Design a protein around this ligand. Structure first.
Ligand SMILES: COc1cc2c(Nc3cc(Cl)c(OC)c(Cl)c3)c(C#N)cnc2cc1OCCCN1CCN(C)CC1
Length: 261
């Protein structure tokens, strides 16, 4: 196969219903890549159009330092393979879990660094008239050696002015998207990013539904166990404002005083 011929598989680094991700060395350049290998989705299914959204997003998206670089995608032997940039820091989700294990944490400065960098990624995507629609720790990836946060997993990417919306994780989902209101989709990414940072700040696991789910959608910031400045807190707070029009845009976010620099 092209997979075996072009690459040497080093180790499986991720698995799940989405398939599996392998750390691979490309024989030609000797560089490390992350390759997702999954069953070729059923024609007409959500998994197909999910994969369609991923591959067709890079047709629009160029290279950006806060978006995981895409190299190629192909199908063979009833399997689909996507070759991406390898981020040696793994996902933000794993980093959060590792913090919990060894009792470390992200300092307030590091949290603002995370917000700004992913903010820069969102600004570019939005400027291409696209929206990510699934921003969460597991979809944020880390490159080190000196720390670069990159947006990955474009399986939910869709147009701004042509809304075809497949909802993302309910834990990060803005209420207006649930209400089938797609007039301000960029602000949905902003909403999810705030909760993503709140996750990195060491907050308890976000609710999938129920009471405290609604309280968050009311604009209530989840309890954070560490001391953040009231100014950073208020920024995160407005990012989850019930009115998406009061939430800052991505380009307004990256220009914000508390974040710079
Ligand atoms: C979770 O594992 C990793 C997934 C990564 C990843 N996912 C991904 C998602 C999707 Cl949806 C894709 O399909 C479009 C494709 Cl192709 C890849 C991208 C991307 N993109 C980039 N970088 C990653 C890096 C990872 O681990 C890095 C170090 C792990 N190391 C630590 C020491 N030890 C325990 C051995 C394992």
């Amino acid at each position: 196969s092209r997979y075996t011929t072009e690459f040497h598989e080093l180790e499986k680094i991720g698995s799940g219903e989405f398939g599996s991700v392998f750390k691979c060395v490309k024989r030609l350049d000797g560089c490390i890549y992350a390759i997702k290998r999954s069953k070729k989705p059923l024609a007409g299914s959500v998994d197909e159009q999910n994969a369609l959204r991923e591959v067709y997003a890079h047709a629009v998206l160029g290279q950006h330092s806060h978006v995981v670089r895409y190299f190629s995608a192909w199908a063979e032997d009833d399997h689909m393979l996507i070759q991406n940039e390898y981020c040696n820091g793994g996902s933000l989700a794993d980093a959060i879990s590792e913090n919990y294990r060894i009792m470390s944490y992200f300092k307030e400065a590091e949290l603002k660094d995370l917000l700004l960098q992913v903010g820069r990624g969102l600004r570019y995507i939005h400027s291409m008239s696209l929206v990510h629609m699934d921003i969460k720790p597991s979809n944020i990836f880390i490159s080190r050696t000196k720390v670069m946060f990159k947006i990955g997993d474009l399986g939910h990417v869709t147009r701004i002015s042509s809304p075809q919306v497949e909802e993302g994780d309910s834990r990060f989902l803005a209420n207006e998207v649930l209400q089938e209101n797609y007039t301000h989709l960029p602000k949905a990414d902003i909403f999810a990013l705030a909760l993503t940072v709140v996750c990195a700040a060491g907050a308890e696991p976000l609710p999938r539904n129920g009471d405290q789910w609604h309280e968050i959608r009311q604009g209530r910031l989840p309890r954070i166990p560490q001391v953040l400045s009231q100014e950073f807190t208020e920024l995160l707070k407005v990012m989850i404002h019930p009115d998406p029009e009061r939430r800052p845009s991505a380009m307004a976010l990256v220009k914000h005083s508390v974040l710079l620099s």
